[PDB]
Design a protein around this nucleic acid. Structure first.
Ligand code: ZN
Ligand code: ZN
Ligand code: ZN
Ligand code: ZN
Lengths: 72, 73
DNA sequence: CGCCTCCGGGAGAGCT
DNA sequence: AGCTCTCCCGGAGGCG
């Protein structure tokens, strides 16, 4: 069962308001809080799945917000 | 692995300075911050183990303080 | 990044 | 109507 609304990988539970895997949970916390510089080199449409997750952090962050993920 | 120095059930790790299970963890946090009104019907030496934890919160609370559990400020 | 261990705490069950 | 206890998630720090 257990599927992450962001990357399709196995979800470990509901994190920051959305059902996600472990890696997407910590990717998000780091994206908000830390020093980063993400820029899409595509059209802002990038496919986000387990194999291509690392390719476009900008699109990975975009999908997170659009699913309503947030901090405290 | 890992005993619980207070009730002996099974320890998940160290909580508030002492190696304890999860139920003692949350019992202690609540015993301090709450209106509690616990008192012993024994001689204040009651045995505290998994089967008897619920008998004497007063003594269970004393075992925590004797093991040095605290929060602070 | 992706994963781990460790500790704190909220909340909804369950038990008299 | 309180206590009690497991389940779940958040944050920090470490490591490959
Ligand atoms: Zn994911
Ligand atoms: Zn992109
Ligand atoms: Zn215990
Ligand atoms: Zn007693």
């Amino acid at each position: 069962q257990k599927v992450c609304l962001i990357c399709g990988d196995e979800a470990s539970g509901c994190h920051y308001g959305v059902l996600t895997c472990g890696s997407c949970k910590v990717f998000f916390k780091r994206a908000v809080e830390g020093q980063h510089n993400y820029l899409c080199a595509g059209r802002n449409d990038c496919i986000i799945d387990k194999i291509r997750r690392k390719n476009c952090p900008a699109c990975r962050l975009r999908k997170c917000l659009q699913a309503g993920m947030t901090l405290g």
